[PDB]
Design a protein around this ligand. Structure first.
Ligand SMILES: C/C(=C\CC/C(C)=C/CSP(=O)(O)OP(=O)(O)O)CC/C=C(\C)CCCN(C)C
Length: 688
């Protein structure tokens, strides 16, 4: 007991105390740092030397202890051996590394599945030549190595080295492998924290060549922050802030951290620029992955961000991770896809982005190529598959969350830079535990109400009023998958019950003006065909009364009058034309059942404008004519997204309710023919 509360607390302290990043140490990078000469032929950073000796793995290698990769182990180990030997320190660990290297170098190509660390083919041979330079006894002539030495010389002939010296590029992240270097020019492309593109190793190499004091400071700060070691990229503050918020929302638990998340997004917004962003604040080089994620979250939470930010990544209708490079990672395109779906109608560049990323991912799934360069994830195919299957316009919170809890790798995910690395605050088993418990608690609540909802259906003999059992479950499902919180049962239930009653009335009396007239008369008279019209009316009136009573008994709020007015307003329009304003009725019901006083907005202009949009979306449930219908909903929803997202956090509760109802209808229009598995997972299959 309270274990849950105390776990929310520990996640809150994490969020409150985020700095420049919780990222694991890179042995490769701290080796480069350890090589630095203080000047008097002693290490400038003895604590980096110490870290290396202290963190060697049991088999003599250095690297990620939980995910073995020959590439990762060998480059990490060779670097550490070089560092220790060049100072003749810690000969015992230095000897173990050498043995490991001797015995495993021939296994470099033994893994079909392994990813390559970034820039391995230039970085590996370069520290090989450093090792040979200090007479380290290692098989420099290992057959596997002939192939990677050739690859290096060719990589280098292709590098735009002159451009590398004139403008900031990703190449600055890996200088330690290159040869023709003009430091007078490069130092002008130094980052504002003194690093060369937030790489300690590239920066360490630069310091050895220039003795530049700003490089030293970057190194000093990092070495200190990490007690001797350094990561392979730092800072990683935007990356971490953004990814933490994305994961908490998708895990379905973000509502516990609304204050903390708001503060994270303010931080991010603070460092947003018209060119976008990268993983670290104050960069001259941006990437589409970080930009698309920040863009999506900022816009989603009411920040004003422009889509012109994506213009720089666009070339000839295609989109790229980095300006001036051809790289197009699956995860970046995935995040681009997600971002593009929050486009306002005026934003052409996002239409093109959406068109491009969708087809990119589509093709890559068809080809069996959903593998990413930047990360090793539990279930990338499943995440992409979901995204392609379920547009944001049709993405109900519980549905996305139910699948993602199954996809989230927790602490098992591994990121890929110059070496393998982890992000403990993004990929965290604790978040998952919390997510599973919270999901299961809410689900249990939903099952209770499903049982109540069925009894209600039976007691009122609604099956004889033309409501099928399959329709009953679908109605409850849409409400619960949207308004899912345990403490929001009144909103969830009024919506589910209202939609059912609307379907019964429409099926039993919607056929013609007379029957509709017949029914509305009875409703008002109550408060052959006229006898039963009175019966159904009693069901409506009956359940309306029960609901307001329960609200009154638990929250003191009396909503009787507004309740009947709303139903009254709907009855008149339907009377005259048939079902036309169901969407609006649902929204009003939900707002009424809220434990607030938002009903005063029913008057506001903003409210009215949203009402007419939603009524264009929520069609009176009725091949090629289908594409038309769905495409038309999207255009109307495009307008609603704009209106709703750009809202002061007072009326926002209302605007968001319009979106919720709209998405539900959209989802049903799109997927309503094959919901059985979704419903089963969301409502009836426990997580874990
Ligand atoms: C500057 C970096 C990459 C170099 C450019 C690349 C990879 C080109 C691929 S081509 P290549 O593999 O051929 O490389 P070369 O061998 O040519 O140097 C990325 C450093 C940032 C991180 C690690 C954090 C990522 C955060 N988030 C976006 C995930």
């Amino acid at each position: 007991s309270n274990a849950f509360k105390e776990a929310v607390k520990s996640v809150k302290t994490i969020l409150r105390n985020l700095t420049d990043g919780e990222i694991t140490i890179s042995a490769y990078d701290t080796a480069w740092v350890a090589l630095i000469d203080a000047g008097d032929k002693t290490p400038a950073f003895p604590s980096a030397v110490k870290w290396i000796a202290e963190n060697q793995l049991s088999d003599g290698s250095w690297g990620d202890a939980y995910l073995f990769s020959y590439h990762d182990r060998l480059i990490n180990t060779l670097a550490c051996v070089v560092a220790l030997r060049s100072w003749n320190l810690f000969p015992h660990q230095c000897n173990k590394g050498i043995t490991f290297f001797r015995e495993n170098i021939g296994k470099l190509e033994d893994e079909n599945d392994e990813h390559m660390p970034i820039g391995f083919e230039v970085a590996f041979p370069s520290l090989l030549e450093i090792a040979r330079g200090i007479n380290i006894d290692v098989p420099y002539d290992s057959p596997v190595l002939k192939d990677i030495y050739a690859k290096k010389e060719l990589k280098l002939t292709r590098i735009p080295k002159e451009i590398m010296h004139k403008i900031p590029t990703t190449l600055l992240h890996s200088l330690e492998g290159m040869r023709d270097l003009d430091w007078e020019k490069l130092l002008k492309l130094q980052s504002q924290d003194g690093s060369f593109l937030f790489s300690p190793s590239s920066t360490a190499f630069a310091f050895m060549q220039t003795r530049d004091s700003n490089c030293l400071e970057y190194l000093r700060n990092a070495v200190k922050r990490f007690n001797g070691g350094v990561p392979n990229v730092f800072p990683v503050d935007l990356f971490e802030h953004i990814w933490i918020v994305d994961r908490l929302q998708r895990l379905g638990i973000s509502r516990y951290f609304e204050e903390e998340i708001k503060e994270c997004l303010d931080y991010v917004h603070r460092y947003w620029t018209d060119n976008g962003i990268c993983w670290a604040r104050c960069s001259h080089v941006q990437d589409i992955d970080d930009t698309a994620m920040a863009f999506r979250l900022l816009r989603q939470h009411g920040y004003q961000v422009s889509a012109d930010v994506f213009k720089n990544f666009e070339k000839e209708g295609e989109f790229f991770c980095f300006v001036g490079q051809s790289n197009q990672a699956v995860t970046g395109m995935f995040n681009l896809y997600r971002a593009s779906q929050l486009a306002f109608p005026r934003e052409e560049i996002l239409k093109n982005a959406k068109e491009f990323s969708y087809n990119y991912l589509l093709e890559k799934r068809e080809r069996e190529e959903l593998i990413d360069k930047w990360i090793i994830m539990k279930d990338l195919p499943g995440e992409i598959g979901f995204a392609l299957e379920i547009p944001w316009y049709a993405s109900l919170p519980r549905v996305e969350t139910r699948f993602y809890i199954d996809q989230y790798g927790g602490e098992n995910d591994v990121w890929i830079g110059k070496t393998l690395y982890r992000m403990p605050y993004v990929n965290n088993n604790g978040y998952l535990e919390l997510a599973k418990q919270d999901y299961n608690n809410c689900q249990a609540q939903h099952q209770l109400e499903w049982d109540i909802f069925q009894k209600w259906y039976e007691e009122n003999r609604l099956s004889e009023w033309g409501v099928r059992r399959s329709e009953l479950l679908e109605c409850y499902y849409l409400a619960a998958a949207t308004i899912f919180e345990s403490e929001r049962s009144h909103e969830r239930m009024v919506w589910a019950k209202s939609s059912v009653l609307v379907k019964a009335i429409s099926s039993s009396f919607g056929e013609s003006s007379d029957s509709r007239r017949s029914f509305s008369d009875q409703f008002h008279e109550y408060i052959p065909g006229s006898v039963q019209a009175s019966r159904l009316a009693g069901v409506l009136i009956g359940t309306l009364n029960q609901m307001s009573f329960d609200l009154f008994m638990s929250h003191g709020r009396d909503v009787n009058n507004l309740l009947y007015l709303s139903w009254g307003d709907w009855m008149e329009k339907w009377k005259l034309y048939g079902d036309e304003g169901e969407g609006e009725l649902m929204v009003k019901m939900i707002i009424l059942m809220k434990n607030n006083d938002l009903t005063n907005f029913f008057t506001h202009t903003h409210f009215v404008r949203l009402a007419e949009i939603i009524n264009r979306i929520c069609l009176p449930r009725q091949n090629d004519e289908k594409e038309k219908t769905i495409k038309s909903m999207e255009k109307e929803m495009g307008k609603m997204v704009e209106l709703a997202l750009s809202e002061s956090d007072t009326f926002r509760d209302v605007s968001i309710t319009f979106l919720d109802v709209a998405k539900a209808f959209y989802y049903f229009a799109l997927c309503g023919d094959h919901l059985q598995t979704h419903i089963s997972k969301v409502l009836f299959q426990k997580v874990g």
